[PDB]
Amino acid sequence: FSKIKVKQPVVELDGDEMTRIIWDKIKKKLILPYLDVDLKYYDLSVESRDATSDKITQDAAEAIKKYGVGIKCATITPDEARVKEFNLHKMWKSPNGTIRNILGGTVFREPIVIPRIPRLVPRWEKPIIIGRHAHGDQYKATDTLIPGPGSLELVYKPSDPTTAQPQTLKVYDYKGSGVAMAMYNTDESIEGFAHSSFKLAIDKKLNLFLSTKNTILKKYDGRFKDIFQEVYEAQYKSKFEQLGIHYEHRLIDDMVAQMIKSKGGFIMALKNYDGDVQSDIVAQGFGSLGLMTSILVTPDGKTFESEAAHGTVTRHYRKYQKGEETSTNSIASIFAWSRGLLKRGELDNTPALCKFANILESATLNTVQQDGIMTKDLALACGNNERSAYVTTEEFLDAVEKRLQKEIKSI
Amino acid sequence: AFSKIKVKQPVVELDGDEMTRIIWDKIKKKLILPYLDVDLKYYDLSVESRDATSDKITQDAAEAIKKYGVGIKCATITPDEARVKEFNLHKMWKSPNGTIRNILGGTVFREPIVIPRIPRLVPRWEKPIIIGRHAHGDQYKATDTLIPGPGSLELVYKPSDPTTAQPQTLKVYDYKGSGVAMAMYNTDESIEGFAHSSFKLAIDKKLNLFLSTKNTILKKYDGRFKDIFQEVYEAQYKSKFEQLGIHYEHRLIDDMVAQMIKSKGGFIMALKNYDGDVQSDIVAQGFGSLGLMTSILVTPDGKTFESEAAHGTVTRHYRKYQKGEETSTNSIASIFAWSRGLLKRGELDNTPALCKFANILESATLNTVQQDGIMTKDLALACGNNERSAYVTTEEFLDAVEKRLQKEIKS
Numbered sequence A: 001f002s003k004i005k006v007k008q009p010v011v012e013l014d015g016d017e018m019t020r021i022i023w024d025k026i027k028k029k030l031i032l033p034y035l036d037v038d039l040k041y042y043d044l045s046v047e048s049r050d051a052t053s054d055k056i057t058q059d060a061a062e063a064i065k066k067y068g069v070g071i072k073c074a075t076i077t078p079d080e081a082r083v084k085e086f087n088l089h090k091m092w093k094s095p096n097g098t099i100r101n102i103l104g105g106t107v108f109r110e111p112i113v114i115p116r117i118p119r120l121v122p123r124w125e126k127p128i129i130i131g132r133h134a135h136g137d138q139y140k141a142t143d144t145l146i147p148g149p150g151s152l153e154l155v156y157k158p159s160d161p162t163t164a165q166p167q168t169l170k171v172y173d174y175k176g177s178g179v180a181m182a183m184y185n186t187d188e189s190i191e192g193f194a195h196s197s198f199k200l201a202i203d204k205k206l207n208l209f210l211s212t213k214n215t216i217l218k219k220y221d222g223r224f225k226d227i228f229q230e231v232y233e234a235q236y237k238s239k240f241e242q243l244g245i246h247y248e249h250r251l252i253d254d255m256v257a258q259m260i261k262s263k264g265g266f267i268m269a270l271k272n273y274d275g276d277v278q279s280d281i282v283a284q285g286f287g288s289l290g291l292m293t294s295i296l297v298t299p300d301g302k303t304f305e306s307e308a309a310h311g312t313v314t315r316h317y318r319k320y321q322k323g324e325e326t327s328t329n330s331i332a333s334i335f336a337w338s339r340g341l342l343k344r345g346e347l348d349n350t351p352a353l354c355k356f357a358n359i360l361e362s363a364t365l366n367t368v369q370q371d372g373i374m375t376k377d378l379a380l381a382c383g384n385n386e387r388s389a390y391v392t393t394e395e396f397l398d399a400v401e402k403r404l405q406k407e408i409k410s411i
Numbered sequence B: 001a002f003s004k005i006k007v008k009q010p011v012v013e014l015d016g017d018e019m020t021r022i023i024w025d026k027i028k029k030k031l032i033l034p035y036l037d038v039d040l041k042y043y044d045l046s047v048e049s050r051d052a053t054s055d056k057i058t059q060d061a062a063e064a065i066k067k068y069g070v071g072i073k074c075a076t077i078t079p080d081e082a083r084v085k086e087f088n089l090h091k092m093w094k095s096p097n098g099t100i101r102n103i104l105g106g107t108v109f110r111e112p113i114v115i116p117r118i119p120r121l122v123p124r125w126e127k128p129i130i131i132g133r134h135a136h137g138d139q140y141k142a143t144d145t146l147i148p149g150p151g152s153l154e155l156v157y158k159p160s161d162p163t164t165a166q167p168q169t170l171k172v173y174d175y176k177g178s179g180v181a182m183a184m185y186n187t188d189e190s191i192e193g194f195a196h197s198s199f200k201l202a203i204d205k206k207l208n209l210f211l212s213t214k215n216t217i218l219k220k221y222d223g224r225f226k227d228i229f230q231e232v233y234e235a236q237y238k239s240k241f242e243q244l245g246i247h248y249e250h251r252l253i254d255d256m257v258a259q260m261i262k263s264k265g266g267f268i269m270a271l272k273n274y275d276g277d278v279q280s281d282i283v284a285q286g287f288g289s290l291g292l293m294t295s296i297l298v299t300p301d302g303k304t305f306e307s308e309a310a311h312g313t314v315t316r317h318y319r320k321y322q323k324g325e326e327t328s329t330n331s332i333a334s335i336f337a338w339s340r341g342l343l344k345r346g347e348l349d350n351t352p353a354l355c356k357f358a359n360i361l362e363s364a365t366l367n368t369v370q371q372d373g374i375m376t377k378d379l380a381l382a383c384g385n386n387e388r389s390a391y392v393t394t395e396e397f398l399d400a401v402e403k404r405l406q407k408e409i410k411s
């Protein structure tokens, strides 16, 4: 096969355990044999991050910004148990949280639909896309234990007193021990969130819903509502009217209820935390947490980070190390690669690359849909409880490879 | 019965707004007052009443509930920008529910009202899912504000007793541009109450209990909910759980909502204030309709209760009612607010006759739909029946329930 020439380099972030094993096979068998790619490799395994005191994560984020497209393998955020078992320096923060904070933007999540997989919410016939604000709020929050009675205040001091007033807000007078936290966001970040959301709505020709709790957090959430409306009237109003699509702000309560009783087919812009929770509800409702894509996008339309949206399970790895067979789904990791390559193709105007990314995806879905070859989790979701109903982690990937070859020849 | 049942202690009634107020009075006159000799401590929480008393009536009502033990509340309107304008309100008064919950503290238990006949949007949900929502702080008592430009943001705590605690000045953020900020709190006392009520309900209903948090991100704040529940659990409920064969477990909110969507129901989800607010609507919708859900606020000591109609009022229905136009609004949620409240009243006063009445009221109400197929517009549409004849009017439904109440009260 005559290899497709990728013009610009692609930033690759390796991950942990089982997904790392899967990641290497995908790269060696499904990508490298067909593409001549310059991969800027960053090892984000727990061991690598510990050894560099998490500096490797920051470097990888900056590389993505430099080159434009990053593709990331699922990683492990160590807990107390792991820190002790592997003698880590500390409970390192989520590489994902770190990358999102550095790149900023929006994380778009949507189900990977496989006809055969049963939907847990039957009426969802059309994809629901979650546009999760990638920055601030709880993920960059300051929280602390309050040991006893005392006052708690939120204090703001402008860098320039003549252009702004200081603020000292009474938060609470404790009468006993408790907890406290403060969080923030910026208008610039919220504005980018809005631009990407409106642009995706336009590009996909879908209605856009922004949801908040601005009835309770009148200033904080109210700010998201006002910025979205302002951006809407600044550059997208007539575009939406021309396409016949709509933008509407809704109370988060009402939105999730309408989402649950709908047929899908719309985009839900959500604050960082709500986007996190709801994307799992949506992924699960469509069929499986393992069938979801996740791509971080910056408002300038120049930077993308495609990540394996399905976490790795240490149990599978344990069995893998013991030489026992496994059946871990590799679809989410395959799509991280395909969606990243698609952005690379678009940015570089390399149609041959985009075509490849699309067949890689169809060959993967058809292996399941048409050939009935799948891993344990999907077989089970399908009510196929026979041992012979699924193949091993490696068998699935070998099947996809064979399919990729076959489908590539057809063209 | 036809003699009337003597309710020993007064019941606090909080009247509401628009269409729900209309249904509320009909319920009282036809389904409650004719059978019960009850002393109702009436508090009008309509928008006009609250505006006239500068929201003082809401505070008085909450204190009456604490004084007498049981309150029954009709749905109320939380004014927004437009409403303040159209009705010249003095202020955008805060939600009465948030005010009442802050004063009484405790936990709000949300549970679906199951009518087997009504289709479920999440098919596998065959067993009730109960949401135990912490009713106190977090974002419902938060302090939020806009940040005009560059400057420092700090969370400052000053202990009342310098010897037992140190002051804290935590740098929240250094703005380089305008943005938003907020701070919130909760207390060990409130969280402990939340835990006790949750474990007791689990033991009472013999269901597994899951507490969900984002303690991976909010290590101190959310970690406190996790630690207090575990302490309380091991100290006085673990043994009983083990005897009953039920389990308690803490889960990441991400995993829990996914497991919830994939499950068959049959468990209690203890959730922080905000998550409980959002997830209860998802659960209510999933079982069939937002209008089929009960909501009862319970205090830890077990002596105070506020049964509320969770089904918000709809202005369009009210406007039609005003014009004398035909209406078909569901009253099931309002009926259960009364029944559930009367049950608490009966249990506290040890009045078996009241509890029997409350139960027959509920049975008559649901059988009116389940057996007689008599229902309002929303339920009929839920059953995929769009013909006019498929449903009855608001009044017709209530008359049907009243008739069955009389039938089933002699039976």
Ligand SMILES: O=C(O)CCC(=O)C(=O)O
Residues within 6 Å of the ligand: A077, A094, A095, A096, A097, A276, A294, A309
């Ligand atoms: O890194 C983590 O802890 C999870 C981040 C996340 O929400 C995602 O990758 O979708």
Ligand SMILES: O=C(O)CCC(=O)C(=O)O
Residues within 6 Å of the ligand: A215, B078, B095, B096, B097, B098, B277, B295, B308, B310
């Ligand atoms: O008053 C409000 O804004 C809604 C409160 C709520 O969530 C409830 O009553 O269940």
